[PDB]
Symmetry: D3
Subunit: 251 residues, 6 copies
């Protein structure tokens, strides 16, 4: 969008760093420089003493539709997730519409997710013969357990905001026409809270839950690099772009 | 054509592995547990196999150990390790009882499609024994520590519906639809991107199963301790005499 | 009671009652240290097959006192209480009525089974005075309810009802109507009459599976609490609680 | 067993069992009339304190297999259950479909097996609900869920039926038979006259429209069996096809 | 103190009517019910009253009829009728037991705010009696007929959370919030458009209460018969004695 | 014309509330017009289902204008939908408020978007429910939930409405339009005469009080528009402030 650098829009609204994914025309699909740009602003929030909370949202119809340079983009995505979880300040995702593939990992890296009634979470990777990325394989089971994670990954089904909330995937659900006001309420309340105690709470929860994040991210990066060489990905990438149902062979 | 209580057939790209002792409610002994792992190993080597179906013939999926402690323990642990390390999806079609190691067996699989009358139960402590097969490691990353403690300590039957609501299992079926949904899930996963499924499993295994082996070692050691106790003696005796055990904590 | 802890034998059950009802069983270091030995001393006691943990008065436990100025001391003692319960090779049951707040939440959730009264609740109120979770709550909670519901509890300081805690899988048992006492009795009877050695082995396997980060996380919480009491936000939090008004946090 | 119904006494319980398992307890007029008679005769029988209604075989009752006569007899069976001053418990295992649904839901208590289900399958063959189901279901699950069941002819699981308030009791795991047994034992040993009175008061609160609605349903069914849509529906069912409905 | 077991007070625009025989868990007799009726009806002509709050003293909202059958049954019916036809909103603040007529009484009100440990029970048949106050008519248009049959035939306790989830009652509370939610509801309602509420009530009553009087007359007749029965005598004796009644159906 | 737009689409008559700039708020001519098109679906042999939706951001925001006339027209719309011997499906997205709620709930099926909501906002301005909502809602969700809705004027989410049995269908994610399309295709190809009869029976079962109740609501609203609280309610609504109600 106009005024955004590498598809990321950043502004300060008092104590809030407002970061907005800003390629609405591609439903906020991400590439390498957009990911790198995102993580810079996330990292730089730490040393910025006016920032007490980060708000992550997306412009247009969707929060984030996921990845489009396999090694490169995978690394940059993994780094964004790491930057969000290691930032000693609260990061809130406001998720409306689709949160798909890395879009899903991205929301779930955040401390709190406020989900609009029509929003959804989906690992669509397998639909193109690919595997989850961003660390989703580590983030999701500590949210919803192994069996529902395994289902998300293998079936590529959409999980509604209501279901994601019932499963403990996300901290907040909204209903009716209240998405915006609840998001505003949560943001104002968190950005006025004891930021240092939030930081220390994050460090302890990170140790409790993220021990495997980086080894799992390594396996995903390695897997995706192998999977883009397979006959199934070529078929997957072709059948998606043609609005045809793919014919997978296991090769 | 079953061997050591296991039948196997190919149906296109699916290896169908079926526990075949309905005359004993698919209770398992060591030969049967060893036999299972053989076919999981065949699945890995067989280029035509794109998914494994695991079910029990008859009323029960698997009613756990017939009640050679160390050998059974090792065989049970190895079946679960084989299933979770197989880089191809394994679907458990759970009908009726999944009890004791039966429960660990279903929960080892990547997806579980449960019939409405199926149930999941750690009956171990009814006879003075402890969970096995890695159940102590598998259950908490499904349903959390508190519900796992309760299952193990009270030995209550958990219904398919409840197990589904808790996150224990991926799929539930209702009415008379169990077979058709199971068939649908099988057809879908076996025509799916098998290599992407193997990688997914690998990433998820690293995220969730780091303690599986250490925990299985603790369980085998404990079961070996516990079969020596007077409580196990009473438990087994009370089971056979169709009565309530009188445990004393020794 | 000695140091705010009552201890009574009742058949094969060791009953440990937190007994400072005049402060809603808010805890200090003496009280925690006292609690901890009575827990490990149940290992030794051949008559004890189960431990029951409850609180006298209106609340299970309102958590850390905020008196004493013994920050590292309290944090250490609270940590050791939680470790002793998870490590005792005998079942420990929390019967929770009323408030389980701050370390009171950590305490209940360290137990093997929790039987919650209908009006009971679980709450990480620490952040309302600018402090962070303790006892090792940060490691316990995610393996109960997942990371998202934990972050919320810790960051918003909301009360979680007994009913909600049960749905989430935070606690093993829920009661309703006037049935709390009777259900508690039923569960204590059955557990204390159970295969105690089997229970102890089950606990060891389950601790190996779920508590690998308990110690490192407790050390992080203890360092964090030490840093947090020096902050302007804590001075303001404490002052606001004292003056019953809303704190004005600054992030310093 | 006569006209597809077996009746036996087990202490203070009248066990009435739909006994056409080969046809999944599909019903005709003489079966429906047989059923009415024994339900009604439970009243005079001093030794009966509870009526158990179940079906033999795979299904509780698959519904209608002589339109006017069948509708009247089906309507009589329901009035007979609802007005019997003694509790009737339906033990529902498997399918309760069409009139088999109305039959179950007329009972005072319903104990559902986990794989059991409830369905108004009538419109799949171009017909409407009968037995008085159009009156029974809204005072169980409300008008919107009823409209849905009737118009989509979807199967409602026991679990969902329980959650909606359609049925009094759900069972799980392998416990169906035990629970049914405990419920039957408890009800048959209870204060039968108070149950009789409790029923009368409930019937007056809930069943004012029952006979009037039953009359509309009987009239409707007579009209619908003349339609091309019934003609196509009945044949499609027999030939295992999707029916071509045209609204005439 | 109170007159005939009822205490009345004004709190701003709220008339608070309190069941005040805590020693008997607010069990009700004919004079208490007649008093109750008088004060509910009093609200109609008192212009300072914009809402009625009904609560119970002591440990329970109301344990139902004190074990004058005709007199009491008729008086209970008139209490329910006075609540339902009062053109002002009536709120039950229910804590603890609301049993027998105590359930009917709560369920007559326009809104019910239930404390987390409160519960609703039709305990009638446990003493060989039937529901009263119009409960047979009130309950089915709340929770449906099957759940009503169950409540009446089994005399099981329905927790506040379950009653809420069933649509039996308008408001649930949890944790230590009962008093403050109740206060908030009362403030909001008593400061609301009372006349609009009156009319709202009137239309709703015409939609749902058409059977309330005929059903009440059936309950009254039934209780008149049931107290002549052996089963009532066994039920009363066994309740008093804290043991299992042997019912005969006579 | 009169803020209603109509169109045939195969066997579906699409009726769309068409005053998006006012969030489909309704007045007498719009209500009278809506009646006419609902009524004319009966005699139109190409029509097998009616679809009711709203253009713009809201299904229907509900009801200066004449109270007597508008209330009457509203009542007539609700009687028209419920007596039409063809399925009427409301596709509800956004707000269904006041009569907007009545109008949805009058229909045979309702397919609700995930951000949709249902609300009786009347008492917030010192008025009472209308269109027969007082009769419709208790046979959907029970008297307790109805009383709370009417008295508190709170918004009920689509999810909650579905949980409560208020509405037949719920949608989630981006699937609203797809589900609505599928339900309309399946219902418009169904046994339309069977559906007509089913409706008639359901109506006799559940709508006996509809007209007595609609009369009470029409009388009441006429009284309430004369009150000081309505003057205060409408002022406070207009001025985007909190009303100070006094019970006069």
């Amino acid at each position: 969008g106009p005024g955004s650098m590498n598809g990321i829009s950043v502004e300060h609204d008092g104590a809030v760093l407002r970061i907005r994914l800003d390629r609405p025309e591609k439903l906020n699909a991400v590439d390498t420089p957009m990911l790198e740009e995102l993580s810079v602003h996330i990292r730089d929030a730490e040393a910025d003493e006016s920032v007490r909370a980060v708000l992550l949202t997306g412009a247009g119809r969707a929060f984030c539709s996921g990845g489009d340079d396999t090694a490169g983009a995978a690394d940059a995505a993994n780094r964004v997730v790491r930057a969000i979880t290691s930032l000693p300040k609260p990061v809130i995702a406001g998720v409306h519409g689709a949160a798909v593939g890395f879009g899903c990992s991205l929301a779930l890296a955040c401390d709190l997710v406020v989900a609009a009634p029509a929003s959804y979470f989906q690992l669509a990777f397998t639909r193109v013969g690919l595997m989850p990325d961003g660390g989703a394989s580590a983030l999701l089971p500590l949210l919803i357990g192994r069996a529902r994670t395994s289902r998300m990954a293998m079936t590529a089904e959409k999980i509604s905001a209501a279901t994601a909330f019932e499963w403990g995937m996300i901290s907040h659900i909204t209903s009716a026409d209240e998405y915006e006001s609840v998001l505003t309420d949560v943001l104002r309340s968190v950005s006025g809270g004891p930021t240092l105690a939030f930081g220390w709470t994050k460090r302890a929860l990170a140790a409790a839950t993220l021990a495997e994040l980086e080894p799992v991210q390594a396996i995903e990066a390695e897997g995706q690099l192998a999977l883009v060489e397979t006959a199934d990905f070529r078929e997957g990438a072709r059948a998606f772009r043609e609005r045809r149902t793919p014919n997978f062979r296991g090769h």
